mmCIF file of C-alpha atoms in Angstrom:
data_model
loop_
_atom_site.group_PDB
_atom_site.id
_atom_site.type_symbol
_atom_site.label_atom_id
_atom_site.label_comp_id
_atom_site.label_asym_id
_atom_site.label_seq_id
_atom_site.Cartn_x
_atom_site.Cartn_y
_atom_site.Cartn_z
ATOM 1 C CA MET P 1 23.697 -23.205 55.817
ATOM 2 C CA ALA P 2 22.759 -26.884 56.138
ATOM 3 C CA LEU P 3 22.738 -28.630 59.495
ATOM 4 C CA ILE P 4 25.233 -31.462 59.964
ATOM 5 C CA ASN P 5 23.627 -34.869 60.527
ATOM 6 C CA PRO P 6 25.638 -36.466 63.401
ATOM 7 C CA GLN P 7 23.966 -39.957 62.924
ATOM 8 C CA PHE P 8 24.637 -40.037 58.969
ATOM 9 C CA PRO P 9 27.434 -37.635 58.241
ATOM 10 C CA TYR P 10 29.193 -37.540 54.891
ATOM 11 C CA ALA P 11 32.672 -36.557 53.729
ATOM 12 C CA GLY P 12 34.025 -34.258 50.930
ATOM 13 C CA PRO P 13 33.746 -34.862 47.258
ATOM 14 C CA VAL P 14 35.624 -37.794 45.754
ATOM 15 C CA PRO P 15 37.092 -37.794 42.262
ATOM 16 C CA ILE P 16 34.838 -38.585 39.330
ATOM 17 C CA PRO P 17 35.430 -39.106 35.532
ATOM 18 C CA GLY P 18 36.224 -35.837 33.829
ATOM 19 C CA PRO P 19 35.410 -34.002 30.645
ATOM 20 C CA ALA P 20 38.804 -34.295 28.773
ATOM 21 C CA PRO P 21 40.456 -31.211 30.124
ATOM 22 C CA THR P 22 41.635 -29.479 26.945
ATOM 23 C CA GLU P 23 38.044 -29.620 25.550
ATOM 24 C CA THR P 24 36.957 -27.087 28.333
ATOM 25 C CA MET P 25 39.724 -24.663 27.326
ATOM 26 C CA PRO P 26 38.843 -22.401 24.431
ATOM 27 C CA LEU P 27 41.048 -20.714 21.659
ATOM 28 C CA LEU P 28 41.478 -16.960 21.798
ATOM 29 C CA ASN P 29 39.806 -16.140 18.542
ATOM 30 C CA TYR P 30 42.338 -14.135 16.409
ATOM 31 C CA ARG P 31 40.969 -10.833 14.920
ATOM 32 C CA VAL P 32 42.125 -9.661 11.531
ATOM 33 C CA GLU P 33 42.126 -6.135 10.525
ATOM 34 C CA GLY P 34 39.085 -4.603 8.909
ATOM 35 C CA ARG P 35 37.769 -1.669 6.953
ATOM 36 C CA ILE P 36 34.534 0.249 6.365
ATOM 37 C CA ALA P 37 34.499 -0.392 2.639
ATOM 38 C CA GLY P 38 34.054 2.241 -0.058
ATOM 39 C CA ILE P 39 34.504 6.004 -0.630
ATOM 40 C CA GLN P 40 31.713 7.852 1.144
ATOM 41 C CA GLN P 41 29.677 10.563 -0.493
ATOM 42 C CA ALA P 42 29.736 13.953 1.270
ATOM 43 C CA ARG P 43 25.925 14.661 1.056
ATOM 44 C CA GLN P 44 22.555 12.937 0.525
ATOM 45 C CA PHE P 45 19.478 13.827 -1.363
ATOM 46 C CA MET P 46 17.185 13.854 1.700
ATOM 47 C CA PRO P 47 13.534 13.046 1.428
ATOM 48 C CA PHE P 48 12.697 15.736 3.976
ATOM 49 C CA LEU P 49 13.851 19.330 4.383
ATOM 50 C CA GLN P 50 16.087 20.031 7.283
ATOM 51 C CA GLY P 51 14.813 23.332 8.340
ATOM 52 C CA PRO P 52 12.062 24.796 10.454
ATOM 53 C CA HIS P 53 8.420 25.213 9.478
ATOM 54 C CA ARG P 54 5.737 27.522 10.469
ATOM 55 C CA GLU P 55 2.458 26.537 12.233
ATOM 56 C CA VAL P 56 0.385 29.388 11.281
ATOM 57 C CA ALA P 57 0.422 31.755 8.396
ATOM 58 C CA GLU P 58 0.701 35.423 8.814
ATOM 59 C CA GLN P 59 -0.900 38.052 6.473
ATOM 60 C CA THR P 60 1.710 40.200 4.806
ATOM 61 C CA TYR P 61 1.163 43.778 3.467
ATOM 62 C CA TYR P 62 2.793 46.147 0.958
ATOM 63 C CA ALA P 63 2.093 49.939 1.002
ATOM 64 C CA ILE P 64 0.407 51.610 -1.866
ATOM 65 C CA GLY P 65 -0.274 55.197 -2.659
ATOM 66 C CA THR P 66 -3.489 56.953 -3.457
ATOM 67 C CA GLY P 67 -3.454 59.442 -6.258
ATOM 68 C CA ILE P 68 -3.406 63.170 -6.814
ATOM 69 C CA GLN P 69 -5.860 64.784 -4.737
ATOM 70 C CA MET P 70 -8.094 67.119 -6.494
ATOM 71 C CA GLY P 71 -10.393 70.099 -5.345
ATOM 72 C CA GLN P 72 -14.117 70.009 -5.044
ATOM 73 C CA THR P 73 -17.121 71.987 -5.716
ATOM 74 C CA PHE P 74 -18.901 72.191 -2.405
ATOM 75 C CA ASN P 75 -22.523 73.198 -1.729
ATOM 76 C CA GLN P 76 -22.006 76.225 0.323
ATOM 77 C CA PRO P 77 -24.180 77.436 3.295
ATOM 78 C CA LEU P 78 -26.343 80.368 3.548
ATOM 79 C CA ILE P 79 -25.296 83.669 5.119
ATOM 80 C CA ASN P 80 -26.044 84.057 8.914
ATOM 81 C CA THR P 81 -28.337 87.004 8.748
ATOM 82 C CA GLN P 82 -29.712 86.170 12.003
ATOM 83 C CA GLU P 83 -31.691 83.021 10.645
ATOM 84 C CA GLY P 84 -29.586 80.066 11.709
ATOM 85 C CA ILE Q 1 -9.395 63.006 5.763
ATOM 86 C CA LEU Q 2 -9.644 59.202 5.011
ATOM 87 C CA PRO Q 3 -10.405 55.997 6.891
ATOM 88 C CA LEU Q 4 -7.073 54.233 5.953
ATOM 89 C CA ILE Q 5 -7.952 50.667 7.059
ATOM 90 C CA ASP Q 6 -11.387 50.848 5.593
ATOM 91 C CA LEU Q 7 -10.340 51.943 2.121
ATOM 92 C CA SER Q 8 -7.556 49.290 2.210
ATOM 93 C CA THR Q 9 -9.873 46.363 3.170
ATOM 94 C CA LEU Q 10 -11.711 44.712 0.284
ATOM 95 C CA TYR Q 11 -15.346 43.418 0.610
ATOM 96 C CA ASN Q 12 -15.375 40.481 -1.923
ATOM 97 C CA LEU Q 13 -17.904 38.237 -3.367
ATOM 98 C CA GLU Q 14 -16.169 35.347 -4.960
ATOM 99 C CA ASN Q 15 -17.793 32.021 -6.023
ATOM 100 C CA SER Q 16 -16.593 28.548 -6.847
ATOM 101 C CA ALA Q 17 -17.613 25.075 -7.850
ATOM 102 C CA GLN Q 18 -16.714 21.949 -5.936
ATOM 103 C CA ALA Q 19 -16.995 18.351 -7.239
ATOM 104 C CA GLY Q 20 -16.580 14.854 -5.827
ATOM 105 C CA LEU Q 21 -19.613 13.966 -3.843
ATOM 106 C CA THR Q 22 -20.605 10.401 -2.842
ATOM 107 C CA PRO Q 23 -23.808 9.279 -1.068
ATOM 108 C CA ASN Q 24 -24.130 9.039 2.667
ATOM 109 C CA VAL Q 25 -20.637 10.454 3.538
ATOM 110 C CA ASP Q 26 -19.376 13.868 4.530
ATOM 111 C CA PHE Q 27 -18.383 16.280 1.682
ATOM 112 C CA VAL Q 28 -16.206 18.859 3.366
ATOM 113 C CA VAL Q 29 -15.547 22.394 1.414
ATOM 114 C CA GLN Q 30 -12.673 24.062 3.201
ATOM 115 C CA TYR Q 31 -13.052 27.606 3.997
ATOM 116 C CA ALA Q 32 -9.753 29.441 2.884
ATOM 117 C CA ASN Q 33 -7.064 30.946 4.924
ATOM 118 C CA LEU Q 34 -6.726 34.630 6.182
ATOM 119 C CA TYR Q 35 -10.257 35.565 4.903
ATOM 120 C CA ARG Q 36 -13.062 37.024 7.199
ATOM 121 C CA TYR Q 37 -16.042 34.962 5.927
ATOM 122 C CA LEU Q 38 -19.412 36.658 6.333
ATOM 123 C CA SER Q 39 -21.781 34.378 4.594
ATOM 124 C CA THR Q 40 -21.921 31.127 2.623
ATOM 125 C CA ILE Q 41 -24.114 29.965 -0.149
ATOM 126 C CA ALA Q 42 -24.276 26.383 -1.299
ATOM 127 C CA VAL Q 43 -26.291 25.311 -4.484
ATOM 128 C CA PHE Q 44 -26.621 21.700 -4.676
ATOM 129 C CA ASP Q 45 -26.538 21.081 -8.449
ATOM 130 C CA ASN Q 46 -27.452 17.300 -8.487
ATOM 131 C CA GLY Q 47 -26.905 16.698 -12.062
ATOM 132 C CA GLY Q 48 -29.293 19.164 -13.651
ATOM 133 C CA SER Q 49 -31.958 18.568 -11.033
ATOM 134 C CA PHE Q 50 -32.624 20.738 -7.974
#
C-alpha cells in the first residue's frame, strides 16, 4: 500500500543473475518397502498389576457356634406368705 | 439370653518391642489396622538404663 512518488517513480523489476535453475528443483525421494522387524511376543511380564486395588480394608467375619447349653442350680426365692 | 456382639468381641492386651531409634528425629510406631485402641504404654529401654 505504498504511495507512488510522481517526482521519482521507478519501473518494474529487471532481470538479474540467477541461481542455476536445476539446483532449485529437488528430487522426489524414492521410498523403499519396510517392515516392523521380528516376531512379537504375545504377552509381557509387567512390573505392575493390571487390576484394581482397595483404598481401605474392611473387617471380615465368620460365624461360630457356642456349645451345648446346660442347666443350672438357681438360688430359689422364698414363699410369698405375705412377707414380700 | 446372651449379648452376641459382646461375647464375640475380644478385649486384648498385646505387647511388642520396636527398635531403630536415632537422636533428635521422630520415631513413629504405627497403630495397627482395624483395632479399637484404648491405651498405649511405652517403655523407653535406653540400653539397660531408664
